[PDB]
């Protein structure tokens, strides 16, 4: 019943474009270097401010709706990056990664939107990053097979997101085109103080290396957290010590300021 | 108007029809028998030796697994306590049984191992389970307490068919699984086939990441066993070093290692 109607509401924001994206910095964390942002949705719905995803992405993951909302995401996300690259502003190292969602493969619909994007912005497909859940492996069929092959003949690099919270097949993650996992916040946010959460993040790390995946850390939120992670090799990693999500203008600023140093 | 499978298998149960056979686990490093996986077989008069896979996922289908477990729980501990007293298991033997997730149901596994440890007097330290990966598919409040309980009476427990189901990591760190089984289908395709080499070195990264022990399941192979001896596979279990045995074979087996 109301949630009929949280959903009919976010149609109605997709139709008047009240949809924004903010960005935040991926960085390689031995240089401090920003090299690439995850695109995050927001609503900036005209009756209650600025809604956050984790109040209508699970809803609308539900419902279907996550499909539009995911191609607009696509051709804003691309539509910006090209826009900073012919500003002089993006170096030609930055990259942007968009979380699509499981229901994005139903009739291999993935490909089609993200060829879409691609060709409408001109932006280079390697440019574009595409981040899933783990339990994407719970949902392997031939359809989703055929989608990741795609992807990787296009050259768009695909990361699993949240990795650690879902369901792998140790056999699948070893076969499958993916070019990253991200380590789950909830894991980092406890190193290294809680030998379960820093165990898994050090395993993490050793899988990737034997995998040929390159590795960012989501969450970190201090100095320790930091530390502990390049200390072990961790790549890149994304958190609030370094940068919140940002509005693009924003985002352009910090980008600004790397080229000046 | 033959008999159901069904009716025979209660019949089997009856008529002491089932039995054991043990295929002993091996450390890599000094080829040392260090433990066993019971495995059950059905000697069945109309047939001979009938293996497995005739009756157990017929068994599941049915609830006929759970007392046909029970029996093979207790079957198991009563005879390493045998060779236990006849003097010819050494301190570090154990024997794994295969449990499956229909015996769960009700807390069940709690008290069939309770009663097959009572029954036997065997040390709960001699005894390991092995449950399928998928157990974590279906991972309740009820499944984490048995298996919290059977940890904190002293019984090992492993993960069996590794690399055939699914797994979360947070779980694997969490749960009380103290080793992994990585499946006969991946192993003997390794080396010359890269995909299942492949698979085999993750999995190994992992529980080494992890600190969980690694049995290497269907070792056919000479090359397959310097492969993961080399890598730091601790345990291994296949053809090349024994195929399943009756408790006897079994014993001598035992025996000749002993005498060194
Ligand atoms: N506490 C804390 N949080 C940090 C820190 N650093 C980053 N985060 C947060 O972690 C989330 C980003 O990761 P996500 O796993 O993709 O998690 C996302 C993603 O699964 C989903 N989502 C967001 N945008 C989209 C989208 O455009 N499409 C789809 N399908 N899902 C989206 O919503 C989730 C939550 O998004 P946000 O609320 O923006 O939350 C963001 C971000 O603000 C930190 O240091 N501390
Ligand atoms: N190709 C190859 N195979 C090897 C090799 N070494 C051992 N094996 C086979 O692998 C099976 C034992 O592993 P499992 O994954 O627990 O697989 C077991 C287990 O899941 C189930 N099972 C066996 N005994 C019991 C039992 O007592 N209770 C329950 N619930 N299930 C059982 O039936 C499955 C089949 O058992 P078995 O037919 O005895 O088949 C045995 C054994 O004969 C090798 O070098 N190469
Ligand atoms: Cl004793
Ligand atoms: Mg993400
Ligand atoms: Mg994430
Ligand atoms: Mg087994
Ligand atoms: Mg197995």
Redesign the interface.
Known sequence: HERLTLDTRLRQALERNELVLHYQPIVELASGRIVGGEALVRWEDPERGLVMPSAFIPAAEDTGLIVALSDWVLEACCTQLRAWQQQGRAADDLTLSVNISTRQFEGEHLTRAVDRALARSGLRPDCLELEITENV??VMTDEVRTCLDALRARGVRLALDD?????????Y???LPFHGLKIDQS?VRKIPAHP??T??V???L??AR??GMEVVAEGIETAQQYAFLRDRGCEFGQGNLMSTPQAADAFASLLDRQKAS
């Open positions: 492996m719970l990795f650690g919270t879902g369901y792998s097949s140790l056999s993650l070893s076969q894991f379960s959460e165990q898994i050090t395993t993490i050793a899988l034997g995998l």
